Design an enzyme around this catalytic site. Structure first.
Site, short mmCIF file in Angstrom:
data_model
loop_
_atom_site.label_atom_id
_atom_site.label_comp_id
_atom_site.label_asym_id
_atom_site.label_seq_id
_atom_site.Cartn_x
_atom_site.Cartn_y
_atom_site.Cartn_z
N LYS A 115 -2.49 5.56 9.23
CA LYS A 115 -3.15 4.28 9.42
C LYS A 115 -4.65 4.37 9.18
CE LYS A 115 -5.06 5.50 13.53
NZ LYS A 115 -6.48 5.35 13.95
N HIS A 170 12.17 -5.76 16.97
CA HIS A 170 11.12 -5.34 16.04
C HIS A 170 11.65 -5.20 14.62
CE1 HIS A 170 8.46 -4.91 19.35
NE2 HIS A 170 7.63 -4.06 18.77
N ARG A 172 7.40 1.11 -1.74
CA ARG A 172 8.70 1.18 -2.39
C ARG A 172 9.25 -0.23 -2.54
NH1 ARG A 172 9.15 0.66 2.63
NH2 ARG A 172 11.11 0.11 3.66
#
Lengths: 91, 423, 91, 91
Positions: free
Chosen positions: B121, B240, B297
Site C-alpha cells: 500500500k 466484504h 489482472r
C-alpha cells in the site's frame, strides 16, 4: 417436526404421539406414500421395466429400471433409473 | 509498428477462465495448451483444449499450481510463445512475471515493473499523493499518543474513526464522537492494538457511514494510448466480498462519473500501465470520490462490460500482447457506448443459512435454462460431477442482459427458478 | 477403402492382400489399436477397475467401468462407462 | 418505429439430423454424447437435446436453434464456425 401440520394432525398426535413422531420422520425422509401401486409399493419396480407415477392433476412422470451395480466399498449400491428422458444414478 | 504474432498461448490455471481463454484462442485459431493437477482431472478444461499435462505430482493441490519451475519447463518444452497467468494464483506474483520475461516467453499482462511497483500500500499511497486523485482522508502517519488524535479531532471534526494498520482485521475499527469518548476509545483502541497485535499504528480518518465502491476498467497499448472501458457498480456485498454485480450506474451524477472517467484515464497515464486494469473508488453520499486501489489482472466482471460495450476484452488483450495499437483495432471513445442493463450472479455450493459455509458432495441432477438474453458460463457442471473440497466452489456464472434493470432482474429470477441442483 | 494408402501400405497389400483387408476392416470398425495394455487387449477391463489410455502427446483418457446390463432386445446388452466429466452407455 | 435502432449483426442456424451425403436424407437414432457450446456472442436454443434422449420420426428433426451476435457479419461467421466446433454430438 411440525412445519405445516394441521389441527387434525394435532388430534392424531394426541392419539399416538410416539408413532406420530415416527411417521413424521419417515414422511419427511422418504417422502409421501399413497401415490403408488400396491405391487409397486410392496415388491417394487422390475429391472428392464418401466412404470408411471402420477403426482398431481398434471404432474405425470415415468420411471424405468436399468440395472443395479454391486456394493462398492461399504455396502453402497449404484442403481440406474430413467426418468421421463433423463437419467439418474441413486446410491 | 512491431508485429510479433502469437503462435501458442498457455494457461497456468484451472476452470472457467481457462475455458474462456481457450475459446478465445480457438476463435482466433491459437494453438491451446491445458494444465491440470492430480485431483482436478475431472473438469472439462483439460479435455477441452488440445493438450493436457500434469503438474505438482507430490505437492499440495492448493500449491500444485503454485510451482513456477515445473510450469516454466512445460511452457518451454511445448514451445510456448505466450503464457497467460489468469488470476488469483500467480498474477500477483512478480517473481513469476520476471521469470516469464527471462524465459523469453511472451507475457499476457503488464510489464513486471508495473506489477512490482504496485507492491504494498505504501507505493500506492506515495504515488497517489504525488500524482493522482485524493485518497481516503485521514492520517498518513500512525497515532501513538492521545494528542495526535485529540488535535485531529479538534481540527477536522469531533467524530472520527480509528483504524489499525498492519492488520486486515476489523477489530481495529472504532468510532469517536466526543472528548470523553475520544480519550476512552483511543485508550482502548491502543490497548487492543498493542495487545492482540504488535505495532499499534493507529490512523484517524473521517466518519464514514455508507461506502459505495465503483469500478473503472482501463485498456491500453504498448504505444502510450489509453481507453477507459466504462464504469461498474458493486453496491452489493455480503460482508466484504462480491456476490452479485450491477454494471450500469444506479445513482450516478454524469458530472461525477465524468470526473471518475478523466481521473482514471489520467492516473492510468501516470502509472504507465500497459494492459487490462481497473481502478476502484469509494464514494460517499455527499458527492466525493476516494481512491482505494487498482487491480492489474483481468477482473472477473470484465465480461460484464463485454455486454455493456459490445467489444471483447480478451481479444483486445491478445492484440496488445501481439504489439498492435488500439487505433488499429478501431478502439476509440466514440464507437463504444452503453447498450443495455446487466446483472451478475454466481452460484456456489454454500449454505446461506448458518455461516454461508460451502457444501461438498455429488450433484444428482442439473438442468440448463439459457434465456433469450441470458448468458451462461459453466465452470464445473456435468452429470455425476464431484466438487473438489480444496479448490474453489464455483459452478456457474449467470449474466442477464435486459432492456431495463428490472427486466434483467426478473429474467434472472426466472432463470434461478428454472435451474435445478439437488442433493 | 478410402485415401489412407501409402507406399508401405501398398507393399503390405501386395504381399498379403486378404489378411490386410481383414485387418483394415477390423481397425476401421473398432478404431485404433496398440494403444491398449495387453491386459485390456486380451482380457478387457474388469468392472470397478479404473484405467488410463494414452492416445496422443497430451491425450489422457480415464475410463471407469460402472456396470453391465442384461439381455434386453434380442441380444443387446448395455454397458456403462465413466469418462472425465461424462457418463456414457453402449449397446 | 423511432425508439428502436438497428444494433449489430446476427446469424441464425438450424442443426439437423439429415445425412449430408446421400440426399440430405434425415437420419434417425439415439444420442450418446451431448456437449453444448456457449460464448459471449453465442446463443443456444434446445428443442429435445439431452443425455440419453430419444427422437421420434413422427415429428421434426430440429435439435438446436442457434443464434450468434457480433459487431459485423464476418465476426458472426467466424463465431459460428467456432461454436459449431464447440458442440460434441456423438452417436
Amino acid at each position: 417436526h411440525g412445519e405445516e401440520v394441521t389441527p387434525e394432525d394435532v388430534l392424531s398426535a394426541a392419539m399416538y404421539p410416539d408413532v406420530f413422531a415416527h411417521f413424521k420422520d419417515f414422511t419427511a425422509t422418504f417422502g409421501p406414500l399413497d401415490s403408488l401401486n400396491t405391487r409397486l409399493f410392496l415388491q417394487g419396480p422390475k429391472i428392464a421395466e418401466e412404470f408411471e407415477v402420477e403426482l398431481e392433476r398434471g404432474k405425470t412422470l415415468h420411471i424405468k429400471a436399468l440395472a443395479v451395480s454391486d456394493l462398492n466399498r461399504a455396502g453402497q449400491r449404484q442403481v440406474f433409473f430413467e426418468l421421463n428422458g433423463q437419467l439418474r444414478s441413486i446410491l | 509498428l512491431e508485429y510479433k504474432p502469437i503462435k501458442k498461448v498457455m494457461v497456468a490455471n484451472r476452470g472457467e477462465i481457462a475455458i474462456r481463454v481457450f475459446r478465445a484462442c480457438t476463435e482466433l485459431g491459437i494453438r491451446t495448451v491445458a494444465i491440470y493437477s492430480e485431483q482436478d482431472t475431472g473438469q472439462m478444461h483439460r479435455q477441452k483444449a488440445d493438450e493436457a499435462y500434469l503438474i505438482g505430482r507430490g505437492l499440495a493441490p492448493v500449491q500444485a499450481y503454485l510451482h513456477i519451475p515445473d510450469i516454466i519447463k512445460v511452457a518451454k518444452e511445448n514451445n510456448v510463445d505466450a503464457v497467460h497467468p489468469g488470476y488469483g494464483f500467480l498474477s500477483e506474483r512478480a517473481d513469476f512475471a520476471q521469470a516469464c520475461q527471462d524465459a523469453g516467453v511472451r507475457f499476457i499482462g503488464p510489464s513486471p515493473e508495473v506489477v512490482r511497483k504496485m507492491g504494498d500500500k505504501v507505493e500506492a499511497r506515495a504515488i497517489a499523493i504525488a500524482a493522482g486523485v485524493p485518497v481516503v482522508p485521514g492520517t498518513d502517519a500512525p497515532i501513538t499518543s492521545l494528542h495526535e488524535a485529540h488535535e485531529f479531532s479538534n481540527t477536522y471534526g469531533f467524530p472520527i474513526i480509528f483504524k489499525a494498520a498492519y492488520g486486515g482485521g476489523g477489530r481495529g475499527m472504532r468510532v469517536v464522537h466526543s472528548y470523553e469518548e475520544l480519550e476512552e476509545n483511543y485508550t482502548r483502541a491502543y490497548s487492543e492494538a498493542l495487545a492482540a497485535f504488535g505495532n499499534g499504528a493507529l490512523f484517524v480518518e473521517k466518519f464514514i457511514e455508507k461506502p459505495r465502491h465503483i469500478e473503472v476498467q482501463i485498456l491500453g497499448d504498448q504505444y502510450g494510448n489509453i481507453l477507459h472501458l466504462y464504469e461498474r457498480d458493486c453496491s452489493i456485498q455480503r460482508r466484504h466480498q462480491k456476490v452479485v454485480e450491477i454494471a450500469p450506474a444506479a445513482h450516478l451524477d454524469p458530472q461525477l462519473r465524468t470526473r471518475l472517467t478523466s481521473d482514471s484515464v489520467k492516473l492510468a497515464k501516470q502509472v504507465g500501465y500497459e494492459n487490462a486494469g481497473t481502478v476502484e473508488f469509494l464514494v460517499d453520499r455527499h458527492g466525493k470520490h476516494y481512491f482505494i486501489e487498482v487491480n492489474s489482472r483481468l477482473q472477473v466482471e470484465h465480461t460484464v462490460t463485454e455486454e455493456i460495450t459490445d467489444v471483447d476484452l480478451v481479444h483486445a488483450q491478445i492484440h496488445v500482447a501481439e504489439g498492435r495499437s488500439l487505433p488499429d483495432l478501431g478502439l476509440r471513445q466514440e464507437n463504444i457506448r452503453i447498450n443495455g442493463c446487466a446483472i451478475q450472479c454466481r452460484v456456489t455450493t454454500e449454505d446461506p443459512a448458518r455461516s454461508f459455509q460451502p457444501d461438498t458432495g455429488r450433484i444428482e441432477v442439473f438442468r440448463s435454462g439459457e434465456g433469450m438474453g441470458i448468458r451462461l458460463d459453466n465452470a464445473s457442471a456435468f452429470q455425476g460431477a464431484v466438487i473438489s473440497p480444496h479448490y474453489d466452489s464455483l459452478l456457474v456464472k449467470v449474466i442477464a442482459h435486459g432492456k431495463d434493470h428490472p427486466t434483467a432482474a426478473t429474467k434472472m429470477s426466472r432463470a434461478l427458478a428454472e435451474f435445478r441442483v439437488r442433493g
